Amino acid sequence: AMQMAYRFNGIGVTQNVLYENQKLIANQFNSAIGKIQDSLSSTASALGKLQDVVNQNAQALNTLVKQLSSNFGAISSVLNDILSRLDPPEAEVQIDRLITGRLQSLQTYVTQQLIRAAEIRASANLAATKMSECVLGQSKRVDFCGKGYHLMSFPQSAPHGVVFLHVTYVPAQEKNFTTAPAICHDGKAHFPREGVFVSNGTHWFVTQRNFYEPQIITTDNTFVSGNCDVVIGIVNNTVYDPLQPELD
């Protein structure tokens, strides 16, 4: 629970949002996991990045073996027949032809395999980066390890690969309010310490930039500098301070 709370804190949401929403988040989590199970069990062809590797490697090997059928412009393909039904003089020539041709084919296959393995090594390097940075920790670079803000991930094995279950946090149900950079109070310009200023039309509050949860504008959650002159777009309002009335 507190692991998730820290991660929520890391993405930019005060950890409190987790605790009163813990059951809801758990339910969404398990529903989403079941949905992933359904999608992988029923709908195939989402795993193409391994099927292509296996199929293409197999096809390359298949054509390599098939190459032995071709006569490469020699008298015949099967070696023993020509080596029996030809004099050794002509046999050397025909063998030379077949050797150069087959060796050329084999060397071409080897070069193709080298390039393919270089591509696979680039993919495996990226996989190692993803595993180290989005499993063994939380990474805050956008659209690396999810779609939205990143919460965690779990590795999962595969036949010749790896599949990541990326648990990501996606905000929704936007509501728009009227904002402004500062407030003016006694000629003194107040900016938010963390979060944005909001107004639902007539009253102003301070929220966090990724979850609506208004709080009354207190002097503790706003650092003040400058004055009521130069900030382009200030709005007058009040700034409650708990220090003053409590003495009375």
Binding site: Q113, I120, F164
Partner: protein, 245 residues
């Protein structure tokens, strides 16, 4: 080729001109002393557009980078890719399933249609210098992401491949030096690289942490993901029956 009349004027001692890579581009006819360009007439690739065998059987054909002034044949259209035969141009646009070229794509309503692709749901964001949107709800979602890490560590030996246990073939082969040494070394090298790939991507931890049997993870189900000693867990099995090795 197709013969056209040349602007280029030969000198009185030349017979035929070649352009580059030794192809006769212009020729002077012998009976009139005129000069004719020889250009290759239209040719090019042909591709088919199919919605898949299982869906239906009607298909389209695309002749690559050719006019349709030269040649089943229901509707023709000239696109920047070439000639499209068998598909009717439609004005409205969607997200397209079959790439063609220059943005054109291609089954819907028991017919094959061609149409410029639509980039996305064209909607605008409203802006004003004092309005801000803020989310109130949130959904956590899980996405899979699949990467390859290894191929089959294969190996082939020349001496057994090009010859196949033929002594005299080997005695003639040995004249060619050490191509086999190079090929065996290259395949062994990529095999070593392949084992290193897995050994690097997975062995990131030098303990073996085993979860305690109690599963009370803040109310989070993990029973579908964590390993079950019944079988390697459930999910990896599900993927493990999705390949054709």
């Amino acid at each position: 080729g197709v013969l056209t009349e040349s602007n280029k004027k030969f000198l009185p001692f030349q017979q035929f001109g070649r352009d580059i890579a030794d192809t006769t581009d212009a020729v002077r006819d012998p009976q009139t002393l005129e000069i004719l360009d020889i250009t290759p007439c239209s040719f090019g690739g042909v591709s088919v557009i199919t919605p898949g065998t299982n869906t239906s059987n009607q298909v389209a054909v695309l002749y690559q980078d050719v006019n349709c002034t030269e040649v089943t044949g229901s509707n023709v259209f000239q696109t920047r890719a070439g000639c499209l035969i068998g598909a009717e141009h439609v004005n409205n646009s969607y997200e397209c399933d079959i790439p063609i070229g220059a943005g054109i794509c291609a089954v819907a309503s028991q017919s094959i249609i061609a149409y410029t692709m639509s980039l996305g749901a064209e909607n605008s964001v409203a802006y004003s210098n004092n309005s801000i949107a803020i989310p109130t709800n949130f959904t956590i979602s899980v996405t899979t992401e699949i990467l390859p890490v290894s191929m089959t560590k294969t190996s082939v030996d020349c001496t057994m491949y090009i010859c196949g246990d033929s002594t005299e073939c080997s005695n003639l082969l040995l004249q060619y030096g050490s191509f086999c040494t190079q090929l065996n070394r290259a395949l062994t090298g990529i095999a070593v690289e392949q084992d290193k790939n897995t050994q690097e991507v997975f062995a990131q931890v030098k303990q073996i942490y085993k979860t305690p049997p109690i599963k009370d993870f803040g109310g989070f189900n993990f029973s579908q993901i964590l390993p079950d000693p019944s079988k390697r867990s459930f999910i990896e099995d599900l993927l493990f029956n999705k390949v054709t090795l």
